[PDB]
Design a protein around this ligand. Sequence first.
Ligand code: HDD
Ligand code: HDD
Ligand SMILES: [Ca+2]
Ligand SMILES: [Ca+2]
Ligand SMILES: [Ca+2]
Ligand SMILES: [Ca+2]
Ligand SMILES: [Ca+2]
Ligand SMILES: [Ca+2]
Ligand SMILES: [Ca+2]
Lengths: 354, 671, 673
Amino acid sequence: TEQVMFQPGHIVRGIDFTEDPLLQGRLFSYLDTQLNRNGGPNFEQLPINMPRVPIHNNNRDGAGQMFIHRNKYPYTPNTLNSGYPRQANQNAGRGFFTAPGRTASGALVREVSPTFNDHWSQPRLFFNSLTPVEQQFLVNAMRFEISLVKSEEVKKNVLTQLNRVSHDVAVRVAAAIGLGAPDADDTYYHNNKTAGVSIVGSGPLPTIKTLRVGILATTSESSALDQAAQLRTRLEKDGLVVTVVAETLREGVDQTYSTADATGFDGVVVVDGAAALFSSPLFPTGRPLQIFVDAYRWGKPVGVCGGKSSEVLDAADVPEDGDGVYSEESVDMFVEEFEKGLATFRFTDRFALD
Amino acid sequence: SPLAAYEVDDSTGYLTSDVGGPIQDQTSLKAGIRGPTLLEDFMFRQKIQHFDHERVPERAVHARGAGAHGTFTSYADWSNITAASFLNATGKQTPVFVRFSTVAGSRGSADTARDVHGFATRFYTDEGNFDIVGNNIPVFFIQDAIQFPDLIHSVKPRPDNEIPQAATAHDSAWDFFSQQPSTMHTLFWAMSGHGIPRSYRHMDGFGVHTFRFVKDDGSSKLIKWHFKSRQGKASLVWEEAQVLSGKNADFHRQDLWDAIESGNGPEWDVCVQIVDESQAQAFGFDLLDPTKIIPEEYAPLTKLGLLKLDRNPTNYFAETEQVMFQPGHIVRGIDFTEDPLLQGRLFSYLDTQLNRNGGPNFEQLPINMPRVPIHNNNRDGAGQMFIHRNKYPYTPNTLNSGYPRQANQNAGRGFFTAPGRTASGALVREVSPTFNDHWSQPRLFFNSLTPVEQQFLVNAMRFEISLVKSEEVKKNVLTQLNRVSHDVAVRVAAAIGLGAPDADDTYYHNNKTAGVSIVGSGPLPTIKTLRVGILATTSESSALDQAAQLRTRLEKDGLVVTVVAETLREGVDQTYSTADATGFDGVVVVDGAAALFASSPLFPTGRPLQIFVDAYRWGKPVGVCGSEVLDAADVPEDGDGVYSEESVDMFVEEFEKGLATFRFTDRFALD
Amino acid sequence: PLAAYEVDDSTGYLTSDVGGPIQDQTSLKAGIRGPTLLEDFMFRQKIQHFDHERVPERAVHARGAGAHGTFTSYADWSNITAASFLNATGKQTPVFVRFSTVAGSRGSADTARDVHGFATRFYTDEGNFDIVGNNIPVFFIQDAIQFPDLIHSVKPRPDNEIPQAATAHDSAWDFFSQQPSTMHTLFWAMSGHGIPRSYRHMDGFGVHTFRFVKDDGSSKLIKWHFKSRQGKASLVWEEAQVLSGKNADFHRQDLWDAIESGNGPEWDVCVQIVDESQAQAFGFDLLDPTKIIPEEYAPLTKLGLLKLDRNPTNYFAETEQVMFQPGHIVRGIDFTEDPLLQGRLFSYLDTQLNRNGGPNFEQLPINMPRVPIHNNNRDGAGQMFIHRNKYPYTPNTLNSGYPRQANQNAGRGFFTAPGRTASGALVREVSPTFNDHWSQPRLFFNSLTPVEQQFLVNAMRFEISLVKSEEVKKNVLTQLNRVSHDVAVRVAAAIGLGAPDADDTYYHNNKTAGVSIVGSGPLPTIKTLRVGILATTSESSALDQAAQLRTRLEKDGLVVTVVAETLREGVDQTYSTADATGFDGVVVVDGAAALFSSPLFPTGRPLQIFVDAYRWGKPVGVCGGKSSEVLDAADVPEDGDGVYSEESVDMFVEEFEKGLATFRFTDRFALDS
Ligand code: HDD
Ligand code: HDD
Ligand SMILES: [Ca+2]
Ligand SMILES: [Ca+2]
Ligand SMILES: [Ca+2]
Ligand SMILES: [Ca+2]
Ligand SMILES: [Ca+2]
Ligand SMILES: [Ca+2]
Ligand SMILES: [Ca+2]
C-alpha cells in the first residue's frame, strides 16, 4: 500500500487522453513524483508496480537497478541485436497509439477557453438534486467551516460566490456568521435536478452484511447476558457484526463500556435486563446511556429487546413511537424490524431544518 | 542464483514500457508534423527520465575498476584453525565475485595510472557473504582510519581546478607523504613496479590487516591473508604505462575480460600466515599496525584453497558498478583485531552504500544478495523488494513464537566475538608508541629489490618529485626519504638539483625479505594469454605467409597473436595506424617487411619502426624471423632477448623463453 | 561574484560542522591498543562526510571544466530582441562557462576525439539565461527521443564497459550507419573539430534555431555562434593519443593557465538572423538540427564580447555543481519547434534531481540568480530559504494578490512569441523536410583543404578498422558512399573491403566558408603558446643560450619551458617528464647537440621530443648556428618549411614566431594519390 505508485500515464492500447488541461498536466506530475517517493528511477521494479507480462526495452542502469539485462546493444536502430526490441504501433505489435482523429489548431496560448466560464450552474444542479434534510446538512457544513474563518473580508467574498449558486444557501449560511447575504443574482439560478448524486435519496442499502450492531448489556444480571447471547445468534445469522458491551469482559462480551462509543455501531440495542444502567470506576459517568443517546441523535436505528422498554427509552428521551425506534419481547420480531432500520440506515426526521 | 532469476532477455519481442505496454520510442508526439512536442507523450518522458537518472555516484575511492565471477575451492577441512564454513571440507566450493581497481582516479581514468590497486573478493558462503576487501600491496599509508580523508584529499586532484587526474605527482600528495611518515612503506611499494602491474592477473591480493581465525571452541589465532597469483608477478615500465594510459585506458579490464573469454581464467592460491595471539609484539613491530608486514622468514604461508575467476559479468552496471563490499560482511570463524585502520573501515563501508544506492536496501540488489535465507526484522526503507509475512517484527515476541531466534556461539551457528578478547585502560585519542617506527620496513622492502628494480623505484620518485612546485615540500620529502636510505635521498636529490641531508642511520639496516621483488621472482610460470605483435606487410605475399606460419604455432601455445600490416585483409588483425608497442608483450618483424623500417597516408611517419624500437626500449623480447631491421632500430643482434632465426620452429622456441623472462632489464641505465 | 559564500580556513582551530572545536587525527579507543568507540563523534562526522562526497556525474558531458567571466553588449539590440542583457551599448553581465567532452566519464582524457560542450550562463538582470551549446554546429539526431539510443551506442559496451571515451567500436558505427542523420556531425567529429587544441581555440554553437522576440511581439529566427578571438586550431590524432596518456588534464590546465596569466579567452557572441518566412527557403528546414545555414546565405551579426577571466575557487562547488538548462530562458528569446530542442527542455530540469538528490538545486550558489526571487515554490529536501509569505497560493487576498502575474503586458514577463501556431494531426511522424541526410556532410567535406580531407579520411580509417563486424563495416561504407564515393573508396582501402558503386543522388561541389580549421589562416595571436627549449646541464653555454632565448620569447607572451637532464635555477622540467605534446614549438640550443643513454631519462628521449614535434607539424629549430648534428640525427631537412636554424637569437625568434602563428606545417603529412 505505501509503495504503490499510480500514474494516469499507465495507459493501454484502446484508451487515449483528451485535451482536458487538468488531465494533461497530471501526466507529467505522477511520473516525476515517484522519484521523490522512491529516491531513484527504478520504482516500476517494486513488486506492487511490476507488470504481469514481459518487459522489453532499452531503459537501463539507475540507482536500485534489479534487472541483469542480457542485450548488450540497447539502442534503436541496431543490427547487432537484429533490430530488437521491435517498434510497436497501431499496425504492429499491439502498440499504444494516439487516437488518429485528434488534431490541434491555433495559436500557442496561455489562455482559458471561454467555454469553461460557467462556474455556478452545475453547483446549483447538484444542490437542487439533494433532499431537504440533505440540503440542510450541506448548509450546516458550510456554516461550521465558514464560522471558523477569521477574516471578515474572506467571509464576505465566500458569500458573494455562494450567492451566485443559490441566494437561499447564501442567506442561510450568512445567518450563522452574523453577516448579511448579498442581493440575489439570478444569472445562473435554475430549478433543474439530476439523478444519482443524492445519498439521502438513494433508498435503502441493498445489503446490511458487515453493518455493526452494539448490544448494551450488564454483568449484574445473568438474564441480560442471556438476552445478549440470543440476539447475537439471531443477528450474526444475517451477516451483521455484533459487539456485546458490558462493564467488564468475560465470555460472550466483546468490549467494555470504557472503550465503547456510538460511533462504533450502525445500530444500538439495549437488552432490558440491563435497564438499571440507563457511576462506576470502570467507565465514565453516564457512558451506557450516552452511547444510546448519541446513536439516536445521529439517526441510527435504536431499540430495546425483551419487552420492557419504557425505563430505557424515557431515560434517553427517545419516543417509543419514533421511526427507527424498536421495542419487542420476541428476539425474532425485534431483529426483523431492526434489520429494516439498518437498511434505511439513517432516520433523517431527527434533524432540525431552517 | 539471484543473478539468474533477474536476467532479462531482449533477443525477441516488441518494445514495451516498464509496465509492459507495447510502445514505440523513435519519434516524439507533436501537434502537427512540424509542431511542438506534447506533454502527454508518456513514451518520450519515461524513456528520457530513465536516461536522465542512469548515473549513480562513483565510489569515493577505487572508482575505476572491473569485476568477474568465479569459484573458490577449499583444499582441506580447516576446522583445526577456523570454524568458517566455507573452509570446512576438502573440495568445498563457494561462488565468488572479485572487483579489481585503482584508488585515486575517477571512474573514466586510465587503468595504467601509477597507484595502489584494490582486490576485493566476495565469498557467497553457505553461512553468509564474506568479503575480503584487499589491495595488491600488503601495507597501508596510514595507521588510523580517521586520517583516510586526509590521505585521499591529498592524493586526489587539487580542489580548486581538479588537476591532476589519477596521480600522486603533485605538491599536495608529497606534502602529505613528507609530513606523515607512516606513508613511507606503502609509498615505496607504489613507487616500485607494484604501482604499475602488468595486469590484475599478475598481481597478488592482501587483506593488509591482521584478522583472527576463531575455532568453535572459542580459541583464536592471528592471521594475514595473501592471495598468491598463479600467473606470476609482472609490471609495466613507467614510460610504457604512460603511453598505455592514452592508447588504451581500458587495458586491465580488457586483459581480464579476454583471459576469461579464452578459457584462461586467472587463479590465486588463497593463503594465510598464522601466528599465536602471544606473538602480537614478538616480531619487532605490532601486528595491530597496518604499515608492517610479517616477513615470510618469520611465518610461512599456509595454502587454504584455490580462487579462480572464470565468468564475465552480463551487465557491467548491474554487477560490477553496483557490487557493494564491506569488511563488516564477516562470518562465524573469523574476527576483527584492534587495528585502528580496520576498526574505522567497519563504519565507512556500511555508510557509504547509502550514498551510492540512494536508499537502505542495497543488500537486495542481486549482486549483493546472499545464497541462503534471510531472517530478520529489518523493514521498509526506499526500494523495499521483499513482502515480509511476519507481522510481529520485534524481539522478544510471543505473537511470532519467538522467531527469528537469536544466534550466538551456542545457537544457530551465530557469529561471535573471539571470547579471549579484552580491553583495558583509559579512553584515549592517543597513538600506541609501538607504531612509531615508520622507516625500517620501507628499508627492508627497498633492500629486497634487485639493482634495476631499485633504479626503477628511484626513477619513479625522480619523475614525481620533479613535478612538485614547492621547494619546501621537495626538501621535506628528501628529509623523509633520507630516514629510509641515504642513497635513495642522494639519487633522488640529484634529479631535482637539491642537496640530500646528511645520513641519519637510526633506521638503516641491510636486512632483506623474500617474496616482495617482481624482477627477482623469476620467469613467469605460464605465457598463456601473452600478446605477440607480428609486423608484416601486404606488399609481399611471402611476408603474410611468414606471419601465418608464426601465428599457427604461437596460438597453439596459448599466445594471443596480432598480425599488423598497412591495411586489413585475410590474416591481418590490425593496421599500423592503430598499432602500438604497448599492445604487445613481444614483437616480431617478418623479414619480407624490411622496407617499412627504412612514408604512407595509411599510418604516421615511422610507425612500423617506432613499434619495434619502443618494444625494445621497454625491455620486451623482440625479433626478426626469416640485419637491416636490427640496424635501423639500432638493436644489437647479440642482445639478450633479441632473436634472429630463419627457422620458424627455432625462433618460436627461443622467443617463447623470452616471453617467460618477460623483461630484459639489462637495457636500462643504472646510477 | 560568489564572495558571500566563501569560507576561509587560513587560520583557526578545527571545528565540527556545528562549530565545536575538535581534533581529527586519532580515533577514541578503549585503551591505547584498544577497539574504537561508537561514541567517537569526531570520527563519525568526518568519515560520514567523506563517505558521501561524491554525486552522480552528468549523464553526458561528465568531463569538463569551467570559468567565470563577463559578457559586454556591443549595442542596444532592442530593435531585434527585448532581452535585457542586450539592451544597451556596453552593458555588462556576469557569466559562467563550462566546456566538456560528451562520452567520457569523470577522469577520462580531455583529448579524446569527441563532440565538445560549450555551455554559457548569463546572470542577467531579468534572470539567468543559459545557452547550452557544442563546438560543432549540427547534432547527430533529429528528435530528442533518440538521445538515449545515440548515447548508449557511443558510450562503452554495457557488458564490459569498454571502450572509454571513444566512438571507435562496433555499436557506435552500427548506430551511425543505421541512422543516417548522424552523417553531418560525424564528419565534423572526424575532422580536427573532434580534437581541438584547446577550449580557447574552438567556437560555440547553439545548434538549434531559436527566436528573438521584440517587445511588440514580432519575431525573427536566429542561430547562435560564439566566434573565438584566439583562432581555430586542432591537434593531430597521434598527438592527441599521446596527450591523453601524458596529460589527461590538458584542456582544463590550458584554460586555468591562460586565465591566471591574464590571457583570459574571448569570443564574439554572434547570431545569424533570418525571417520567419525563410524557415524552408534555404533548401532545408530550419527546424532540423542536422543543418547549418551557410554564411553565404546569412551573415553573422556580432552582438557582444564574452571574456573568461576568473578561475573557480572550489571546483566541486562551482564547476561540478553548475546545472545548466535551455529552460533558463528570458524575455526576448523563444523556442522553436525543433524536435531535438523541444525534448531537451524536459531533460535538463529532470536530470538535476539525479545530480542534486533533491529539488532545491537552483539554491546552490553557482545556480542562484543575481536578482530577487518571488514565487510560491515551498519546501523540498535541502530548503535554504525561510519564506515569510504564509499564503503561497494564487489567487489570494490574504497576501494582497502578490506575487503578481508577469506576462507580455505587465512585469516584464516571459511570453511565447505570439505569432506561433500549430496545425494538423497529433502525430509521431518525421517531417519529410528532414530527409536529406547527405548533402550537408558533402558540403562540409568539400570545404576542407586537401590535407584536412586526408586527416578526416584517416580518422575514419582508424576508427572503422577497429570495428569487428564485417556487416557493420559494409553498412558504414554504404552511408559514407552517399556523401562521397571518394571518401568511401579511401576508407575502404584501409579495411580491405570494396567501396560500393557511386550513388550520385546527393553529390555536389558546393563549399561554404568558416568551417575549415586548416584554411582559417595563421593564428591572430601567439600569446600562451608553449615553447620547449631543449638544453643540457653539461655545458654552461647551453644554459646561457636557453636563458637568452627564454627572455626573448617571454617578452612576446609565450610560455617557455627549459628542459634539461636535472632541475636547477632556470630549468623547468627534466627530460624524464618532458614530451613533445607539452609544446607548440621546440627549440634545441646548439650547446646541447651531444644529447641528440642516462639513468635520468629513457633512452633517446631528447631526440624523440624533437622528432615527435617535427612529425606532428610543429615549428622546430636549432638556435646558435651549429644545426647539422641535431637536424641530421632527427632526419629533419634544414630547408624545410617550419624548420629554423639561425645563430642570432633575435633573428631565430622572429622566424620561429611566424611558425608558431602558422601553427601546423601540413606539408609533412602524406596524401592519398
Ligand atoms: C575510513 C575509511 C576507509 C579506510 C581507512 C579504508 N577504506 Fe577502503 N573504502 C572506503 C573507505 C576506507 C569506502 C569509502 O567506504 C569505500 C568506497 C566504496 C566502498 O564500498 O567503500 C572503499 C572502497 C575500497 C575498495 C573497493 C571495493 C570495490 O571494488 O568496490 C577496496 C579494494 C578498498 N577500499 C580497500 C581498502 C584497504 C585494503 C584499506 C586499508 C587496509 C582500506 N580500503 C582503507
Ligand atoms: C533529450 C536529452 C538531450 C538531448 C537531445 C541533448 N542533451 Fe545536452 N544534456 C542532457 C540531455 C540532452 C542532460 C542529460 O540533461 C544533461 C546532462 C547534465 C545536464 O545538466 O543535462 C546534458 C548536458 C549537456 C551539456 C553539459 C552542460 C554542462 O557543462 O554542465 C552540454 C554542453 C549539452 N548537453 C549540449 C547539448 C547540445 C548542443 C545538444 C543538441 C543540440 C544537446 N545537448 C542535446
Ligand atoms: Ca501514435
Ligand atoms: Ca597539488
Ligand atoms: Ca618493475
Ligand atoms: Ca561495441
Ligand atoms: Ca586538422
Ligand atoms: Ca536521494
Ligand atoms: Ca505566453
